Amino acid sequence: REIVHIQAGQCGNQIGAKFWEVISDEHGIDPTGSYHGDSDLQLERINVYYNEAAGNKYVPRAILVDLEPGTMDSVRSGPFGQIFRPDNFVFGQSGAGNNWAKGHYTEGAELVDSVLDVVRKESESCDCLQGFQLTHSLGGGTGSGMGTLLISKIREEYPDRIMNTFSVVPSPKVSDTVVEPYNATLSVHQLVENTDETYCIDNEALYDICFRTLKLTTPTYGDLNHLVSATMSGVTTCLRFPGQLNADLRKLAVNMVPFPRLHFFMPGFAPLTSQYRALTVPELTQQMFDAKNMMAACDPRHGRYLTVAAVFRGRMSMKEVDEQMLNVQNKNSSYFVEWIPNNVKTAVCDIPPRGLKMSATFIGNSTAIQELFKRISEQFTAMFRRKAFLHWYTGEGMDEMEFTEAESNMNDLVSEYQQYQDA
């Protein structure tokens, strides 16, 4: 039943806010928290993401966290900013300076308890909490360092609940500082141990989509976040609307994660937008499996699919959907591991997203995701072999050994993905 949502740091709170805008519109919830929709399907699983307050008000089960106020002042002024519970805004003043150690060990530690108080108050009133979703980046300090601290503390207090992240992976193409690969390697180490499912949202891929496909010569954070929000709407459709398949976080984990560490998913979306032509079922299906539609910059032809979830939204022929899903599997059979039979599952939901008649969302557990980790690993090493920029971290009490261990664990994750690809 209930999911608790947490958004941390600049990136986490920006994508987080858009997520709540997009799903509040799909469920007919306006910025005051009033329902003004046309269909009982909108309210039937509303409690998964929204609490009900007095006056038939729907309030997101959402906690907003940062070490600086700036992005959270912007959240509060944003279009849906009034819908959040005021007590669920938990902010420090210090900032974290793009420094994972500040987020995880010094500044974040000072604030983490007050975040947990709010987590506990939301959790306490859940009829049957399924677990948590966190939105954050891995390249900064607060979402990366403080976010992974939160995950660890949440696990200690709710060890039998599911932990899910939407984790934005850094790229030099859309880069704020040189230390991003350090912060991401340190964070991946945490995610490998302490999440059950992680959607790898790669800024490399979002940028390439905006540039190559959508023809945006200069992509902003807003253009990248349009892709992120459509993806997030798509991958949570099964949690939010009535349906058979992957209807809660645990069942999704059980279908998607054959070995506990290999829980890093490559999302995709079709059609790609920033337009009037009807998209056919064959076209959605080909495009949702296309490298160019993937939100992690990994070539899926360089690996194999362990498991896949496909979600189609809109009024369309279920027969045609089944036939096309079967067609892609039959013609591309070598890219689906033979030792997990029937490893592709398909859901269809009648309610389309805003501004589209038809859409498809793709969630892949592919061994090609190793490309993402290798790219981060190479950027990490190029610096770390000269100990460049380390004083930012050792000044917060960290040793070099902790960097060596994180790098080694992420190289092990890469070797494991490679083992199942060769099996």
Partner: protein, 67 residues
Amino acid sequence: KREHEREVIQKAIEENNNFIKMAKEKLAQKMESNKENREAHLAAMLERLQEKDKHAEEVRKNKELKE
């Protein structure tokens, strides 16, 4: 992990305090050593000058005990 978290933040506190301490003691050692050196420079100058006043007395006596 909680115990590692506590050691990182104590290590940071310990290094910052140690930096402050060592900078405080270095400064105090420099300012002392400088004071003593300057005073020894001035005391040697005065001492050469007192030796001149002493020698000027031996001159007025040589002249008195000449006559």
